[PDB]
Design a protein around this ligand. Structure first.
Ligand SMILES: COc1ccc2c(-c3c(C)n(Cc4cc(O[C@H](C)C(=O)O)ccc4Cl)c4cc(OC(F)(F)F)ccc34)noc2c1
Ligand SMILES: COc1ccc2c(-c3c(C)n(Cc4cc(O[C@H](C)C(=O)O)ccc4Cl)c4cc(OC(F)(F)F)ccc34)noc2c1
Lengths: 244, 227
């Protein structure tokens, strides 16, 4: 079908841009998780929290590079470009994060290490429940068995939302997302012919994404007030400033 | 097919469970208009009483969903527990516009501005549901589309504490196909309506979590727990 075909080209472009933007893919991660990592499972080896903040900022930079390649995005009103990244970039971080996680832990340091879930639950202060909600999401989301060619359209869909608070020209945004959603649907149908209504089920997962970020926001307010000693990068700080 | 039967059954059960349908609401949107004090803990508490009403109507509707009464009883309980609130806001949208909501089974209409003017705690009580209703109402769904949507919501295998997820997702699968087909047939030129509707569930839950945040002995007993 002539319409399908355009969607197929779009998928390929997105997938290719994803590969260029994100050095550590789900495929490399799974290969590593199943070359092999040094494992950290207890103290014998705030610093960790600052590491996750460091990686986040880097991920924000990587996701911003990717977004620029989504057809139409850079042509949007520059203020709406800022708004979509502000409300979308963390939802994308937790998505990509699941790629690095299994039930028991998460890859760190470009894949060269693996820090266990339990170690992270045992941390002091208001830090023990810092990563947990992500592991809980990752486990449900990883069950969908998406791969990078699927994820690549999905995260695009997440960026191009016409319901983000305070958008000026919603119309141009909903036209692009309309496209990304058809592309994803086709992609999921072709790539997972036997998985029933996977499209429906992935989109429902978008719900837990939003719960993670708003819950992470609270947790940040807690941690910053208990530890007046703790830096928050201006980049993340600005993303959370308005928000919800 | 099974899927049009499923869709007709759900619509039929929806008409019978819910007195004031979107179709009836939209016709109106004449009601007594409450635009100011001349026309409150009483309003907030009244809303909580209406919520208990709606839970009952929604629960009765759930029993008509093919397969639902067959699930483990504890699991029907936890599905309704986490489902009814998301369904209340979905149904409340039917009764709202940008300027106010229909109250009193359609005979009253209270303005969005009067509600926003209530003393500090209660002034933002409703405003998040108005903001959602405006977005959701742009999809222009009607009752037959909504009948299936809310069944979908009820059949969510991700609710915490479910004993047996498999049959629940099996059923939501049927409903989702049924929903998807309903929206292709009813809304031909609404390109990705199915997907856009499912995305709205993201705002739905966020309303619920935010509302939990903001939140006579025999009366206290009736209208406790299930909010
Ligand atoms: C763009 O997509 C992406 C999303 C997430 C991530 C990542 C990435 C990884 C591997 N972790 C786990 C992690 C990283 C650590 O960092 C140090 C530096 C180390 O790794 O040695 C230490 C301990 C733990 Cl548990 C986190 C945590 C995080 O914070 C939060 F959002 F709050 F969840 C954001 C990003 C990452 N990396 O690359 C991406 C890309
Ligand atoms: C089952 O589907 C349904 C969902 C919601 C509703 C309703 C319904 C209506 C019309 N309102 C608005 C309303 C009702 C009031 O109460 C009085 C008694 C009145 O209703 O006149 C006063 C002021 C306002 Cl803004 C609310 C508020 C509510 O609480 C909460 F969820 F917390 F928001 C729950 C239900 C309703 N009615 O019927 C249904 C059915």
């Amino acid at each position: 079908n002539p319409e399908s075909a355009d969607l197929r080209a779009l998928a390929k472009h997105l997938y290719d841009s994803y590969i260029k933007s994100f050095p550590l893919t789900k495929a490399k991660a799974r290969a590593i998780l199943t070359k092999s990592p040094f494992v950290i499972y207890d103290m014998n080896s705030i610093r960790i929290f600052q590491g996750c903040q460091f990686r986040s900022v880097e991920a924000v930079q990587e996701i911003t590079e990717y977004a620029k390649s989504i057809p139409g995005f850079v042509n949007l009103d520059l203020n709406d470009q800022v708004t979509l990244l502000k409300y979308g970039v963390h939802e994308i971080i937790y998505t990509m994060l699941a790629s690095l996680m299994n039930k028991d832990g998460v890859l760190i340091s470009e894949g060269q290490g693996f820090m266990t879930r339990e170690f992270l639950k045992s941390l002091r202060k208001p830090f023990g429940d810092f990563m947990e909600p992500k592991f809980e999401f990752a486990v449900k989301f990883n069950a969908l068995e998406l791969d990078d060619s699927d994820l690549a359209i999905f995260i695009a869909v997440i960026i191009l939302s016409g319901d983000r608070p305070g958008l000026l020209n919603v119309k141009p945004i909903e036209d692009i997302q309309d496209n990304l959603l058809q592309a994803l649907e086709l992609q999921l149908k072709l790539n997972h012919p036997e998985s029933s209504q996977l499209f429906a089920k992935l989109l429902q997962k978008m719900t837990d994404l939003r719960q993670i970020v708003t819950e992470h926001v609270q947790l940040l307010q807690v941690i910053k007030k208990t530890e007046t000693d703790m830096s928050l990068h201006p980049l993340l700080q600005e993303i959370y400033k308005d928000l919800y």
